[PDB]
Structure formats: structure tokens, C-alpha cells
Design a protein around this ligand. Structure first.
Ligand code: SF4
Ligand code: SF4
Ligand code: SF4
Lengths: 625, 626
């Protein structure tokens, strides 16, 4: 009964039973040990920013402990904690985008063996969009070098606004300018946030949250957008394609390589290495029928979008994938890689390989990958996987399920091509009421919530109401395993959405990529708002993260709100200890940026709130629901 | 009151604590008492709040539970990530300050800063030539300033391999940083990568986390802080030796008392210029005041002291007590280390609390935001508010406690070398001969957990007694000053060797070298001595000490001193003791890789023994007498 309460999936149930019998502790077991959690940490009323503290703000009968040693009240302490929370998340996406710039610079210099510019057409378009002279005709490497220079300048301190901010409608850029939210530099907003949250600097919760919006905007319109667009340039723009999801993508007769993390610069070369004939011969000589690459988390989302590589699972499936006994190697870069995977791998034959200087795990096998040596290093990593496969215990192998078919690869380019090259067919459907609105579901998993129970229920509730769902991150696996990522899932949608979906041959849920690919949603909203001559806060759109946990999810939520997109959260951030901060997040922000946060653990109630905002925006546009 | 005596060693502090008690005004010590005892996990660093799978606590339990976070992170990772963000917050404090100096200098170069000039064009040309500006000696000053601005901005970019001022460090030190992966590449970049590394499921190795923490702090001392110091001297003048006064007695009953608080001189320099305008002086006269009296608090007070000789009212734990005097007519604040309780205590009086920076917002304060293009008009408006507040001053609540103590300030490296005849050779000769056995930079704040300035003053006395010259920055300036140690006559309190050298040069045994960002002056001086002697900084008989620190910035200064080869003592430990591995590396392991380590010791006399021990050992390795 305990195992049933932790997930809605059979492959998760099977592996939780297996781990229990083998005495392997999982994320759910550790979540139980940390319950009940500290009230002050959950409320955000704890400050550790100097050693005059640590300080706790409590509501006491005797009136003590209302202020920190420095005099800060709960509003400042909660706001500064939330500001650093957002900054850590924005920094996660920022360094990711910085790595794509360096990779593209290596290709332009001819110092990346095995890497190329897969999409020169998009390279010329993005470079011309940002002001590169003669981007349409000059040599591709020269054009790439100028785009590299432009992107690096957004990681400098001399701009007035980020380069991609020009995509946002003019009314939105003027608003950001009036509010002091205009993001100037990707790294700069992160550094200034850490300065503001230092003792005795910014001590106004309104100022701190305004800069928190500015910091997250430097992510969505900077770090993440650069990461998405350069990844398509380097590795190809996604197109619609079919694949499979869940633990059944692992094969007993093959060498199973699971890529984990966020950077496609590594996993793309891992895949190229497994396709070399000499490498395949080595696997055959070892008794394997083939080498099978399968994806985890966002880098799995990336390989899914561009190569159709099947995904093994999402956040809370990562440990369970090793428990299958068929994981021969885990190739990790950085972010959201639970260090418990090292210990669980030690229980089996699995090799846990780290590849990034930023993602170091004690006890892991480190094979550091850079653009100049990726081809040889990734070949070496695959050979380690083939070797570990030879030591695999066949009696402990249990692959639980059969893979479920999914459809992926819905970039904005792919969406517009399916519409004939213009957004007019999409705008027509919204005006007609067939598609009443769009909601991006971009959440994770969280041990406090039965895995994917809220992701799937909300996705079902929204498509029932003719609201198209845009899926990224961990929701990709949830919607996939529920059979909603195929064109045949139109039968589960309402009459309006099903008709549009069947007309285009697309699912009612569109996989648009990884967590950084939420910038694709920003681009799509900006494109629609610009076309109609309105603000993004006028579009019938919404965002939802029903089962989030990370700093990156909070930064995504913040820049969606700051861009005019109403954003729902299944769980609250650590801010409830301040009524002023909570009121601003839930209500005050609506007055300034035209959107706000929503906290609601009931997915059906979450759908009512998302649909309510959509209906209100449809009315202001003069449409019927 | 036995309690009031236990909180500070100074009479003006005792007098104001008695006054605040009689008037029912709670101070920083009173809130410190309420927060005692503090949470064990917060003090140990074994608490993580970096995601809402937590918050997580690491406990030592009989049943073995709560050994790992929900993500699987152990105490070593959790403590190192918390300490890494602690350092990042401190480096960000100095980073944004240096960035503001770059923008101010760019405004002057563009001719868009009315009232600002390049006060030290000679230093501008020297710094620009040092960093590679072409024809810095002959081209127009504004063109030279513009090219230096571009170089400094590039250090706040993401395309450099090493910071521009890193060339000052000895080659052996630069090679070591390169081998360790510590070379700071971009000021903002290291801060952003640290926040990325400490995100869940990124960097989960406490050794890697601390190595990048060193890299982040090096981006401060050799980047954010060093840019701030050198451009400040270019904009506002290079400090030279001068006389002034310290303590609450610098406030005048017959004058409009304006206290500048914070860290950025871009504001306080123009406040001072505003008070010298005849129309502004006429307004003070029309209000009945004999003059306009500007006095300093914290680092911006250190800045005005070094360059203008403006008297200092007090250090960190004196800031509230200065308002309790009843004579503080205005507080002009920029950012950092400004306790928000000053707003409430000001409301108890006539005092105007004025904020000036978009980054330094205080709820309930009067905000008059200052930028280079409007500073001259805005600062004029701020002084008028002080004169207006002065008219509403209640004379019955006025109590200025003490008589000011004389001090000598303005010892920049340029001033130190000028007193030596233009070369460091007399200083090196004194060190080799054993008259000056070593140097210790005493930096740091106050901390309510320690009787105010009891450790700062005792250590300063213990060190100069042992012929160890003290270089004072930050809050120690006020401590040494009020103890009468910042004057040439204080050579009598030193040993025979230091007293002879001090009397020979006419300098005190304690040299005030400026604010917290001016600790970069100590890096420059150490680097100059190491290069001249052809050794590493880890070979010099030097030390750093922060007996009464509290802030993230103090931790970042200590870290980049250690990472640069300077043994650094702390009176109190950071929140790291919950990890034996992290504690061992900070106290011992770093000695193996960077040639220096942290020291935690609350007894100031024992702190002097440890600093002297490292100094003696380095003298032996140099082939000198101890
Ligand atoms: S959140 Fe604060 S009070 Fe709670 S355990 Fe962590 S440090 Fe202690
Ligand atoms: S910054 Fe203020 S509230 Fe936070 S720990 Fe320090 S004294 Fe306490
Ligand atoms: S990062 Fe790990 S240890 Fe920290 S709060 Fe999240 S789950 Fe707990």
C-alpha cells in the first residue's frame, strides 16, 4: 500500500518492490526520514546570511524573535531567501547557455572534431535577427563567430537589454522598462541579486521581488533562450517524430546506456559513438545484440526531440532505472542528478560516469568531456558501458513494462510548418473557440506528491476543456506513459481540440522539449502577441508546475509570470511565513505585470483557475469561450 | 549595569547604551539576546533549503535516519554548498561596488557626470598602461579612461581566461592557480557558476565546491575589490597621510550633523561637495547652525577618511548608538552592512534616513536615488533635508558622550612607498633585519557575540608589541583609533624594532589602509613584495585576521587571502563545523594546495601566537632571523 501511494505507474511499483526486497533506500524513503520538516525553513522565516545569526522569525506570545539581529523583519528575510532561490535556478540555466556558446565557438574555430553546424539555415536566421551583418551570404563559420560575440555580450555588463528581448512585444518591453525589470546581463542579474540579499543592502521586500523578476527574465529571455536556439543550430531543429517511453525502453539483449543531466553537447556525441561500426563490433563481441541508448530528464528530452531516442523516465524514475538491473552505464553532466544514483549504482554493475567539471560526484568515474576531445572521450565512455555489461548479473534483471509510443519534436519551427508557414490557422482556431487556450505544463516530480498523479490529471482536465497542453521537462514522461503524446489521444480531448488535432495530425499534448526549451513557449507567446498587436498578458495562455521541486522550476515560473503568463504551482515556495510576500506573489504582481502565481495542490481546482484566467483573457480579446 | 559594560569597551558606547535603555530603545545586542540560543543546524551548516524536496537536516541519530538529504546529499556536500553560497554573497557585495565605479568612470569619460572629474590623472595613466592601454601616457585622459573602462568591463564578461589585475600576482602563484583550476576568469561569472554548482544535483563533491569557492573569492580580491579601489583613487584621489578624529564626539551640538553610511564613495564624495556650496551653507546658517558637519560610518566613512580626512563617528555596532546621541540630523546610506533597525531608531528622533542606491532600499526610508548624471543636484537636495531635520531637533534629548580621539589616515600603497623614498627597499631591509618581523592585516567587523572591539584592540596591541606591523581596514580602523594606536606617538606601544622604524618614518605602528575593498591594497602590497623578492606570497611573513567578523564579505576576504597564500585567523568559525571533512580542509587541507589555511581562535592572545608562529616559520624558510 505504501508503494502504491508513491507512484501511479506499474514500472515504478515493480522497482519499488524490488528495491524494498533488496534493501535499497530510495528518494521516497529519505523523504519520509526528513518528515516532519523544519517549520522555519518551510515558511522561509530562517536567515543564515551572516554569523550575527542564524536568525529565526517566530510568532511568539511574548513578542520576542520578531526581528533578526540586524533588524530585518520576516518580509525582508523571506524575500531575500526567495531571491536567492530564483537566482540559483536562473544560474542553472545560465551556465547551460554559456556552454552552448562555447561549443558553437569551438565549431566556428574548427576546434570541435565531430561537431558541426547541423542547421545552417537557422544559424543564418538567428544571426540576422540579432544584427549580424550579411548573415544570409557570408561563410557559416564567420556568421557563427559573430553570433557567438553577440551571445557573449549578453553575458557581459554593458548592455541595456538582452538581445532576444526584442522578440517580446513593444508594450511588454515598455512595461519592463517602467518597472525596472528589463534584464541587462545574464550573469549580472544573478550577481546583483546576491549583492542585494547580503546583510544591510536591499531591505525592502518589494524591491527584492522586482529584482527577482528581473533575474528570472534574464534566464527565460537570455540563458535559456540562448541555450535552446544554439542547441538547434548545433544539433538540428526538432521535427515531429515517433519514439517510446518508460523503463521498457531498456533491452535485456543490449548494452543499455542512460544519459542523465541537461547538456546535449555530451549525449549527442555519446549517441554518435554508439553508431560507429568498430564500437558496435565490440558490443557484439561482448555478447550484446546492439548498443541501446535511452534518455533521462532534460538531456533525454533533448535526444528525444532531435534524434527520437526513447526516454526511460523522469525525475523519480532515475533511481528505479538502475534497479531494473539492466542499466550498464549512466552518463551524467549536471543539474538534477541525485547523488544517491552513485550509491545505487554501486549496488549493481552500473558505471556512473560524470563528464562535466561542474558536475562532480564523489565516487563517480570522471571522464571529462569538452568540445575539443568529445569524440575520443565519448568513445571511451561507451567502451566502459560495454565492459560493465559483461559483468551484469542476469538474475537481478527486471525490466517491468512494455514501452509506450509517443510523438515528439514540436519546436516552433515544426509547429509553424504544420500550419503552412504562418500562425494564422492557429489564430483562427483560437478565435473560433476550437482551441480555447494553451497551457504549458513544465513541472518535475516531488516526493510529497504521488508521482505524476497531478501531472496526468491536470493534463487530462485541460485537454477535456479544449485547452491545448504544451509539455516540457518531466511532464513529457507523464503525458507519454498516459498515452497522451500520440495523435490518437485526440479522442480523449474535447470536440474542438480533437478536430484541430486530427486536422493537423498532431497530439492534443505537444512535446516542446526540455526545461530550457520553455523559452520556446516564450517565443511562441511573443510571436502570437506581436502578430495580434497585444501583450502576452492578453493571450489565452497559462503555465503550470503541479509537482515542482527545484530552484530552476521557480525561476521558470517567475519569468513566466513576469512575462504576463499566469503560472500555477502545486506546492508553494518557502514564502508563507510572510503574508506581504505571499500577497505580492499571489495578487500584487497581477497589478504590475498582468500575471501572478497560483498555489493549488488539487489538479482539478488548478484547471479551474487556469481556465478562468484563459476565459477572462478571451473576453478581453472580444471572444467567446 | 554589568550587562552594558559587557557589550563594549568604549565609554561612548556605554553612555549611549545607558541612554537607549532609559529611552526604551532596543539595540543590536538586545535582538542578539533574543536569537540565543540559535538553531544547531544553522550554526553547523548541516541544513539545506536549496529545493522544496527539503528543507533537509543532517542528524546523528541512533537509528541512523536523517543521514542524507532527500536528494541523497550528505553533510559534506550540504555544508560546502552552503559555504560556497556564503562566499558568493560576499564576493557579489564587492563585485557590484566595483561595477558601480566602472560606470562612474565611464560617465566621466563621456562627460556625463557633472561635478565629477579624474582627480588623479597620473594614476589613471599608470593603471591604464599597466593593463595594456595603448599610449596611456600621451593620449587624452578621457580616451585613456574609456579604454580602461573597456578592460574593466571585460573582466565582468565571459570571454577572458584570467582577470586583468591577476598579472600583479607572482608567476609562481599564477601557475599554482592554473594547476588547481582556481584562476578567476570573470567577476560575475564565478558567482553565477557557484550558484549553478550549489543547485541540486550539480556539484556534489565538497572538494570541488571549495576549490571553486576559492576561485570565486579570488575574482573578488583580484577583480571586484581591486577594480573598486583603483578606480576610486582615479576618480577621487589617491590617499596620502593626514590627520583626523574618531568616535561619537566628532558630532557637534552647534552644527548640522550628517552621517554617511554604507560603502560607495560615489555618493558621499558629492554629499561633502554639496555641504561646501555657499547656498547650502547659507541654509544651515539661516537655520541657526554654526556649520554643516559630515562624519563617517563604516566603509564609506573609511573612504572619506582616507581621501578627505573626514572624522569617523564609529564602526559597525556604533551605528545605532550614533543616532541615540540625539544629534544625528541625517543618515545618508548607499548599500551593504546598513542595519535596517537604523530606520526605526531614526523614527524615534528627528533623524532623516536617506537611501541613495536602487540596490539599497529600506522600507520607510526617504529615497533620493543618486546616479553620476544627477549626483550634484540630488546630493544638494539630500543636505537640504538634513538642514530641515536639524530644525526639528529636540535639544533636551541631545547627549554627545566623549571627546574625539586624534588619528592619522591615508596610507595607500602609493603613500607607503612615498614615505619610503619611492621604493620598497627600506621596508624589505627592515623585515630582513628583523626590526619589522612581519605584517598582519587586521580586518573584520564587530559581532555582538564578542565584546565590541575587545578582540580587535587586544590583538592589535599584542602584534605591534611583538614588532609585527598592523595594517588596519574596515571596522578595526575605529577600534585602533579610539585606542590611540593610529598616531605616530603610539610607537611607544610597539616593540623596539617596530618603534624604531615607525619613529624613523613618522608613521604610526598601525597603518590605516582604507575600507573593506581596500584589502585589495594588501593583496597589491603582498604581490609587490613577493615579486621583488622573487618568491610566492605564501613565502612572505604576512598574516590576516578578522577577530570580530560577521558578514559574507568578511568570509570572502578571508577566503581570497588564504587562496592567495596568506594565513588568515577568524575569531569565530563559519557555519561549517557540522562537516569534519570541510572543516579539516579549511583548517588544514588548504595549506597543502594554496600554501595557507583558515584559523579559528576566539582568544586574541592565542590568535597573536598563531599568527606570529606562521610568520616565524616563513622567516625561517626565507633564511632570516625570527
Ligand atoms: S531552516 Fe533554519 S531553523 Fe530550520 S533547521 Fe534549517 S537552519 Fe535550523
Ligand atoms: S542577515 Fe540579519 S537576519 Fe540574516 S542572519 Fe544576519 S543578522 Fe540574522
Ligand atoms: S538539494 Fe537535496 S539536501 Fe538540499 S533541500 Fe533539496 S533534497 Fe534536501
Amino acid at each position: 500500500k505504501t508503494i502504491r501511494s508513491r507512484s501511479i505507474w506499474d514500472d515504478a511499483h515493480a522497482m519499488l518492490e524490488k528495491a524494498k526486497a533488496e534493501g535499497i533506500s530510495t528518494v521516497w524513503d529519505r523523504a519520509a526520514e526528513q518528515t516532519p520538516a523544519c517549520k522555519f525553513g518551510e515558511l522561509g522565516t530562517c536567515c543564515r546570511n551572516c554569523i550575527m545569526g542564524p536568525c529565526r522569525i517566530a510568532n511568539r506570545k511574548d513578542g520576542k524573535m520578531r526581528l533578526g539581529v540586524c533588524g530585518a523583519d520576516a518580509d525582508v528575510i523571506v524575500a531575500r531567501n526567495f531571491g536567492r532561490f530564483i537566482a540559483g535556478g536562473a544560474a542553472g540555466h545560465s551556465d547551460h547557455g554559456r556552454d552552448l556558446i562555447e561549443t558553437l565557438e569551438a565549431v566556428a574555430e574548427g576546434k570541435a572534431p565531430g561537431y558541426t553546424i547541423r542547421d545552417v539555415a537557422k544559424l543564418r536566421r538567428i544571426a540576422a535577427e540579432l544584427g549580424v551583418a550579411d548573415a544570409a551570404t557570408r561563410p557559416a563559420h564567420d556568421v557563427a563567430a559573430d553570433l557567438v560575440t553577440i551571445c557573449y555580450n549578453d553575458f557581459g555588463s554593458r548592455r541595456n537589454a538582452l538581445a532576444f528581448l526584442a522578440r517580446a512585444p513593444q508594450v511588454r518591453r515598455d512595461l519592463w522598462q517602467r518597472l525596472g525589470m528589463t534584464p541587462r546581463g545574464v550573469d549580472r542579474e544573478i550577481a546583483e541579486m546576491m549583492h542585494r540579499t547580503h546583510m544591510g543592502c536591499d531591505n525592502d521586500h518589494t524591491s527584492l521581488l522586482v529584482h527577482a523578476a528581473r533575474t528570472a527574465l534574464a534566464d527565460g529571455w537570455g540563458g535559456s533562450m540562448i541555450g535552446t536556439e544554439l542547441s538547434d543550430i548545433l544539433f538540428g531543429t526538432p521535427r515531429p517524430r515517433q519514439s517510446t517511453v518508460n523503463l521498457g525502453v531498456l533491452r535485456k539483449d543490449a548494452v543499455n546506456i542512460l544519459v542523465h543531466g541537461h547538456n546535449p553537447v555530451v549525449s549527442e556525441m555519446i549517441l554518435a559513438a554508439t553508431r560507429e561500426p568498430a564500437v558496435r563490433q565490440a558490443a557484439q563481441d561482448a555478447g550484446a545484440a546492439d548498443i541501446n541508448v535511452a534518455g533521462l530528464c532534460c538531456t533525454g528530452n533533448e535526444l528525444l526531440m532531435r534524434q527520437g531516442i526513447p526516454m526511460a523516465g523522469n525525475h523519480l524514475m532515475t533511481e528505479l532505472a538502475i534497479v531494473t538491473g539492466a542499466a550498464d552505464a549512466i552518463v551524467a553532466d549536471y543539474q538534477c542528478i541525485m547523488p544517491s544514483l552513485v550509491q545505487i549504482a554501486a549496488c549493481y554493475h552500473t558505471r556512473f560516469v560524470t563528464t562535466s567539471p561542474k558536475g562532480r560526484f564523489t565516487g563517480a568515474t570522471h571522464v571529462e568531456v569538452h568540445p575539443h576531445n568529445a569524440q575520443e572521450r565519448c568513445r571511451e565512455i561507451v567502451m566502459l558501458a560495454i565492459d560493465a555489461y559483461t559483468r551484469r548479473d542476469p538474475a537481478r534483471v527486471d525490466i517491468p513494462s512494455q514501452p509506450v509510443s509517443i510523438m515528439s519534436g514540436f519546436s516552433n519551427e515544426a509547429i509553424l510548418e504544420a500550419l503552412g508557414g504562418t500562425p494564422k490557422p492557429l489564430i483562427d482556431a483560437v478565435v473560433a473557440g476550437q482551441i480555447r487556450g494553451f497551457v504549458g505544463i513544465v513541472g518535475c516530480n516531488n516526493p510529497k506528491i504521488r508521482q505524476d498523479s497531478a501531472n496526468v490529471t491536470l493534463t487530462r482536465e485541460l485537454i477535456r476543456r479544449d485547452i491545448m497542453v504544451l509539455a516540457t521537462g518531466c511532464v513529457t514522461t507523464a503525458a507519454g506513459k498516459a498515452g497522451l503524446l500520440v495523435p490518437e489521444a485526440a479522442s480523449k480531448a474535447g470536440e474542438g481540440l480533437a478536430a484541430v488535432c486530427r486536422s493537423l495530425g498532431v497530439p492534443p499534448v505537444l512535446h516542446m522539449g526540455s526545461c530550457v526549451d520553455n523559452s520556446r513557449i516564450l517565443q511562441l507567446c511573443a510571436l502570437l502577441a506581436t502578430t495580434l498587436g497585444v501583450d502576452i498578458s492578453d493571450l489565452p495562455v497559462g503555465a503550470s508546475s503541479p509537482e515542482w521541486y527545484s530552484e530552476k522550476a521557480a525561476a521558470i515560473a517567475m519569468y513566466a509570470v513576469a512575462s504576463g503568463i499566469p503560472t500555477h504551482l502545486g506546492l508553494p515556495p518557502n514564502i508563507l511565513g510572510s503574508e506581504n510576500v505571499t500577497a505580492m506573489a499571489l495578487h500584487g504582481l497581477q497589478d504590475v505585470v498582468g500575471a501572478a502565481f497560483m498555489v493549488e495542490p488539487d489538479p482539478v481546482k488548478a484547471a479551474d483557475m487556469l481556465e478562468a484566467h484563459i476565459v477572462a483573457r478571451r473576453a478581453r480579446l472580444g471572444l467567446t469561450s
